[PDB]
Design a protein around this ligand. Structure first.
Ligand SMILES: [NH3+]NC(=O)CCc1nn[nH]n1
Ligand SMILES: [Cl-]
Ligand code: NA
Ligand code: NI
Ligand SMILES: [Zn+2]
Length: 330
């Protein structure tokens, strides 16, 4: 078996290899990449997402989110306080202000150390889940707005025709902006392109070990676990690498830089943080291998994890027994 230690693999496709998206995902899996739960893909030198980022400042962040932490440095939750709208230009200025800018640091490891030491003591502001795309329409390879849809995948594999769409999201981050531990809706894949700016550090648990992370999370967040048997899909809980190591949880870490893609695989728990101002684009997708995962995916029915109406069909078809309960939750 390939990649038995579940290491994060890094791929360097040639321009020819970059033509057929599906084929390359399948290739990465043939090499065991999925075992890690996350892979990095560095595009060929001839590729670009768009010509420049000079003209993005007028994008609106309709509901910036202030990420207010509670707990202890290595075990905390975050809640998202809504703020007044602002443009990307305004957000960038805020990120670079003395209150929010990245501190002086020696390297990525020193910054990681500062993050886990001090994150709770600050409340960075996050632009999240903004429908849109920054890929040029003429970019034919790895254009996250032009992928095959999950609905079409489900139709091709299972013969059922369903409603719903599948479009990308933009994320605008600053120092200490945090994404909590989670797997995707219905344990889908995700793909993530860092368009512009400072790095984004990722942590990931191998899919074969995701239940170990869940068990730890129930111990560390006991009231949340009593409230919902799938509370990680609320996307609020953070656990540091130090705490994961103390508890024997298998995981890996890697830093993504501008111009790089990250793929998360079905049931690969991930979390991470931004180093400074940046802009990313992401979308969920499926392959034939996902179907099994979608059938088995846990669900939040407590009401906290509201999601896209696209999800309805996925639950309805893949998990008919669970559908009426999940729907009440929505
Ligand atoms: N699936 N992709 C993710 O969970 C990353 C979400 C994110 N990327 N930048 N800010 N938030
Ligand atoms: Cl700091
Ligand atoms: Na490892
Ligand atoms: Ni995710
Ligand atoms: Zn819930």
């Amino acid at each position: 078996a390939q990649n038995p230690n579940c290491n994060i693999m890094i791929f360097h496709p040639t321009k020819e290899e970059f033509n057929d998206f599906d084929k390359y995902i399948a290739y990465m899996e043939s090499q065991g990449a999925h075992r890690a739960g996350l892979a990095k893909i560095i595009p060929p030198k001839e590729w670009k997402a768009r010509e420049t980022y000079d003209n993005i400042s007028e994008i609106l962040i309709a509901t910036p989110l202030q990420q207010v932490a509670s707990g202890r440095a290595g075990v905390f939750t975050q809640y998202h306080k809504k703020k007044k709208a602002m443009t990307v230009g305004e957000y960038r200025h805020l990120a670079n202000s003395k209150k929010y800018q990245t501190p002086p640091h020696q390297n990525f490891e020193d910054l990681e150390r500062k993050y886990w030491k001090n994150r709770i003591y600050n409340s960075p502001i996050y632009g999240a889940d903004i429908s849109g795309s920054l890929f040029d329409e003429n970019t034919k390879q790895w254009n996250l707005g032009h992928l095959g849809t999950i609905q079409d995948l489900l139709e091709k594999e299972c013969g059922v025709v369903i409603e719903g769409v599948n479009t990308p999201y933009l994320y605008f981050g600053m120092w200490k902006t945090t994404f909590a531990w989670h797997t995707e809706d219905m344990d889908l894949y995700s793909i993530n392109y860092l368009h512009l700016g400072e790095p984004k550090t990722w942590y990931v648990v191998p899919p074969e070990h995701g239940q170990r992370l869940e068990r730890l999370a129930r111990e560390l967040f006991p009231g949340s676990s009593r409230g919902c048997g799938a509370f990680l899909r609320h996307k609020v809980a953070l656990i540091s690498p130090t705490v994961l190591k103390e508890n024997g949880i298998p995981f890996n870490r890697i830093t993504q830089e501008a111009g790089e893609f990250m793929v998360t695989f079905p049931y690969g728990y991930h979390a991470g943080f931004n180093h400074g101002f940046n802009c990313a684009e992401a979308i969920n997708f499926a392959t034939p291998r996902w179907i099994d995962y979608g059938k088995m995916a846990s669900q939040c029915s407590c009401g906290e994890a509201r999601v896209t109406f696209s999800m309805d069909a996925f639950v309805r078809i893949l998990q008919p027994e669970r559908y009426d309960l999940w729907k009440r939750g929505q």
